[PDB]
Design a protein around this ligand. Structure first.
Ligand SMILES: O=C[C@H](O)[C@@H](O)[C@H](O)CO
Ligand SMILES: O=C[C@H](O)[C@@H](O)[C@H](O)CO
Ligand SMILES: O=C[C@H](O)[C@@H](O)[C@H](O)CO
Ligand SMILES: O=C[C@H](O)[C@@H](O)[C@H](O)CO
Ligand SMILES: [Mn+2]
Ligand SMILES: [Mn+2]
Ligand SMILES: [Mn+2]
Ligand SMILES: [Mn+2]
Ligand SMILES: [Mn+2]
Ligand SMILES: [Mn+2]
Ligand SMILES: [Mn+2]
Ligand SMILES: [Mn+2]
Lengths: 386, 386, 386, 386
């Protein structure tokens, strides 16, 4: 009954089930969880692995000695459970030093510090077997117009990512980077606010092949955009390196609900696309169990993330395999969208009278697209009402 | 007193002052304007030129004879006034045949028709001296998830733009293309919804040098994004080929208010950036005088567009030239944002103990950015309260 | 298999299935439907009745003779099918005369005209057996701040509704009014923008008992609000006189999708509430079949409205009847929310040491609410995954 | 030069300039300020008074002894400076016990606790001379649909406010309540989300005369609504008891920028209305100096709040006094909006042929409203460009 196994590739950040519940208006409602306990509990629920920021695993300001100890305990829990660590990232947002950003802070000394803190964590990530390193520039941006010259800030962001690519290349590491967009919060406006802006930026880096995107469901929804459409553009460009799955109720603060909550129809269309395109990376959940819950509620919320992905996978698969759906797709001319407009070439098109001079515009205009019938078949499949 | 002249490069679409006032819930409140009359009235107000869709100038379905007549009258009005035509575009959205799109309609025959209608208008545009040809794919998108496979639609969009580039190259024309994003309306979701998504798409075309963006103030604001930030990214990429100026009150239907209405502070920061970066293209207004107005109100609204740009230009210039502002910019370390993080190189950075091992994080964190004082200087300059 | 019957009380506006597909950027894609044909087709699908604006039934500017003829044909179709007319309303938005509003236009003569046009239609509505008369003030509002003094406009709106109440009272009619809010579109801002603002306004009318609200799903969603919460407040006040059901994808133009599309989880919670509270009015659909469809698509979309309500009714009923859900509701203390806080009275509360002096705040704070488990039970029931 | 004095009635919450800068993603960037220091610094800048939550003044869990000491020091600073305390409120949101709400928590014991904590603070407020007591129910709401039955929660909210009214009446206090709406954050949806919903709720309380609203600029803007329109409805109902002034950039997290930032045109129209209507309550700022600033930046931000109100007051006054504006108001028929539609009565209206039978609809429709010219006069006055 929709039971996950390690083969489903479900992963969770330590900071997700570990969120203590502090919000802008309230204190923590839960005690801190030791990373070793989260690894054990997630493994029991059927997860494949975990991810971390540097500061989630090793407390900020730890001595080299303390650092080694934290790593050793963690590595033991991974060995004990068979859990993997497919991705890691850096915290460049919590400490006060990063109040104006890491890579794009106005202060040059802070920008050099941000790069060194990042490089230290890349080494660790490689040691633990991570294949992807995420960068979320949560403090890169502004609340007022004069505070940041965006052209100069993009020069600084490019400079930072180029240096990181030179580092991994020089070291011979087998790791790629994934930039995660967000439109706002905590800054009034954040740089590279959507998947489009991040894809465009990557094309100006020195070694574009090393970088892709890590889109998050609720971030594109904070700009009112269609998440499945954004993922289709990332897949088309060959840059979907990783993904963050969760839920969000429209344009408001970043909610990070469990996957399946928020926009359920968009969750269905997202699973349909990931499974049809054969995405083979981790299915990572970046969510927060609400602060109303105790520890029992935390694990119920984490289990619900995986259950909803499995129900949606079954329903999308039943939709695509139904002969009545296959017929409706041809009725709506999805087969014709997939054929070239003019494989015959420019000259042939220019010489074709059926394309203009003798094209019957009124007859073509009267043809219904039959999209409502197709969408109701999709609704019936989602609801298990066939 | 803020009087425009042709040297200010202010331009208007025929469809702007020519909007009859039909909305989703109401009939037209104004009679149609002849294009010749709009050219004469705009020239009297101090505009530099006009732009058009094919269908604004030559009524859809016109015979070759009628076509020649419409063009001749128009060319006479331009000669009589000294007005120029710096940009043109195609209507691929009004006729019912385009109900599912032009370049990405599911029906192949419609896609071939859309290309031929476009090519016919490129020839005309060149004849009239246009330097830029805009493409707004207002019907490219969907209301439901199964109706459009986005990967296949992006293949079709790329195919169309590649054919257009082959056409202009083969003809030896001196014209470039500018894609105009919009997130929604009239389709539920439109493809290439923001400037970021359009910039990323251009990088996959066969001759990327031929294509840039035509951002519009109110479109990026329909996704809650910061317009000046989006323009800074387009300038950084070298792709700001043209711009549409107007006003919008937040996330709602596309209002197309006169420039200066809507978000006034964002209008100030936009003018500051265009003038500092030395943008030298047209200052084009894509607006609609509200349907509450008669013809006197139409021309007052058009004049207000140009007046507000001129007031904002004066205030931004006074801001940048004030010694007290120059001092506040250094207080907030804008000068340091413009210097390279590590011109010394990767190895030097790795060997620099002042960047990590001996960096005083607490001292750097305590330094205030002085952004509020800078922003209040900007407020005082905008309001003429210095 | 989810087949509607007249007993389900499903109703449709003539303007819904009759929408020709004209949008702000495009011409009509469908021919006009005769009202008699819509009555017959809806009756075959299992609807209970239809509603109309004056102008949908009798073309604007019709002579008394033509008026009688249109009514007679309509009455014949109702008799032939057994369809009823439970609600009617007035068009005070399409004609150019209403460009600044009907009841709150600045011009006094227009305000008197709007009242007379309304009264003429109340008489007709009563003749046809309507129990509710809706008022949607789509043109009451503004695009700019100086154009409308809102205090004076609310005086004018109150004056209009008071006169309407005096009219129905004097005539001895058995009809009540329902005001329908909308936040924007077609005006930049519309007066009484949400259900809250309309409920508050009703309390200042001379005979408040005669007026309630007609909320619409997508209108409250255009302000990012929770529709089921707004309906619960209207039910609490005893003012849910009628409802408009449809779908909307977030904050954007008014989409009017078929019911069940848009926010599916909010559709589930809405049906749960209407059925639990025993709402007994019509289940009216105010939707537009997308302009991509032909007539076959129109009727498929209308049938889908009713099907989705019936599937959701079954799932909400299965949720409330499940013993495991009843247990989870007690686990989350929904039973305690329904008990008075202090039936003992103020003095007893003040004297109760267990309420303050000896209340163990830490013990109460540690109690989890178990909301995630409850919400996953609701997800499983919606998906038919129990 | 726009220097405030105590006579301008400018007030600030202790929590405003006292915000340490902790956000959902970061630690505090400033040290805590002693309330005595904030009183002294605000008095030097020209403020009239301060406001507080119970927990801002007396640390949660303080003994009666400690409580008396905190109050005494505060009262000394007020006496030393001449500052007043016009409003106070309760913190029912920070402590973990309030995770599901105060007045509407599902747990009955928590609801009784919330009432006692509130009553204790009403006594203190009266002692300090407050005239208004604000209630912001920031935790009253939900993240999921089954967690809260809204009808039962509104019964509980009414019960709480009724008990509070019985308390003040029994004690003979001269204090009134003001409910402050917010649509979301920290809960997914908050109950009474806008000024409309709060006004409607007040009408169902036992002694409605004791309660009004405390609207906040950025809260109504989080729902995309027009703030000046909402304030006009509150003034029309006679319920504008207090106001919170700040700035917000559209639909996103609650920014609490300084007043004048965010939507500057809406700030202009708000000042115009408060000054024209003769609002005589405090001009209270509920803002947060951004976490990028040090203490110098905090006081610059607070001073900017008052400066911007004074500049806007001057510009709105110059607008209303300009003869050319007075003429444009008559051109747009604002004078006619203020006259009754039908002082003649219902029968006279029904008998008036000029209102229907002989009304020339086409002539009335052709009359332009001249709103664009009026709005450009308002723009010129705001910018000091007359
Ligand atoms: O909104 C914050 C984030 O999404 C964060 O969890 C990134 O995924 C990792 O740094
Ligand atoms: O929203 C529609 C448009 O912006 C349009 O005017 C384009 O600029 C030109 O086709
Ligand atoms: O947005 C327009 C409407 O909702 C309209 O159909 C009303 O329900 C009836 O006048
Ligand atoms: O968003 C939080 C608030 O607005 C708060 O400061 C209230 O005004 C006072 O409890
Ligand atoms: Mn997030
Ligand atoms: Mn994330
Ligand atoms: Mn536009
Ligand atoms: Mn445009
Ligand atoms: Mn609607
Ligand atoms: Mn409606
Ligand atoms: Mn706020
Ligand atoms: Mn507030």
């Amino acid at each position: 009954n929709y039971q996950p196994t390690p083969e489903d590739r479900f992963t969770f950040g330590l900071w997700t089930v570990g969120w203590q519940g502090r919000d802008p208006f309230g204190d923590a409602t839960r005690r801190a969880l030791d990373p070793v306990e989260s690894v054990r509990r997630l493994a029991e629920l059927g997860a494949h692995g975990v991810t971390f920021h540097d500061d989630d695993l090793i407390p900020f300001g730890s001595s080299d000695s303390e650092r080694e100890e934290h790593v050793k305990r963690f590595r033991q829990a991974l060995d004990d459970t068979g859990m993997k660590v497919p991705m890691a990232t850096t915290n460049l947002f919590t400490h006060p030093v990063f109040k104006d950003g890491g890579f794009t802070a106005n202060d040059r000394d802070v920008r050099r510090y941000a790069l060194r803190k990042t490089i230290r964590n890349i080494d660790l990530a490689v040691e633990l077997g991570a294949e992807t390193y995420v960068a979320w520039g949560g403090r890169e941006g502004a609340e007022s117009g004069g505070a940041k010259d965006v052209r100069d800030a993009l020069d600084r962001m490019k400079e930072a990512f180029d240096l990181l690519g030179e580092y991994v290349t020089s070291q011979g590491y087998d790791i790629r980077f994934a930039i995660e967009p967000k439109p706002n919060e905590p800054r009034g406006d954040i740089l590279l606010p959507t998947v489009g802006h991040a894809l465009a930026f990557i094309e100006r880096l020195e070694r574009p092949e090393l970088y892709g995107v890590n889109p998050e469901v609720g971030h594109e929804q904070m700009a009112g955009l269609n998440f499945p459409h954004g993922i289709a553009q990332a897949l088309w460009a060959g840059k979907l390196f990783h993904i963050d799955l969760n839920g969000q109720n429209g344009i408001k603060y970043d909610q990070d609900l469990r996957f399946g909550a928020g926009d359920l129809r968009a969750a269905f269309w997202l699973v349909d696309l990931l499974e049809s395109a054969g995405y083979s990376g981790p299915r990572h959940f970046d969510f927060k169990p609400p602060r109303t819950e105790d520890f029992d509620g935390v694990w119920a919320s984490a289990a619900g993330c995986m259950r909803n992905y499995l129900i949606l996978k079954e329903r999308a698969a039943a939709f695509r395999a139904d002969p009545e759906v296959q017929e409706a797709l041809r009725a709506s001319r999805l087969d014709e969208l997939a054929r070239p407009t003019a494989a015959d070439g420019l000259q042939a098109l220019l010489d074709d009278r059926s394309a203009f001079e003798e094209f019957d515009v009124d007859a073509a205009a009267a043809r219904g697209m039959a999209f409502e019938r197709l969408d109701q078949l999709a609704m019936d499949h989602l609801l298990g009402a066939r």
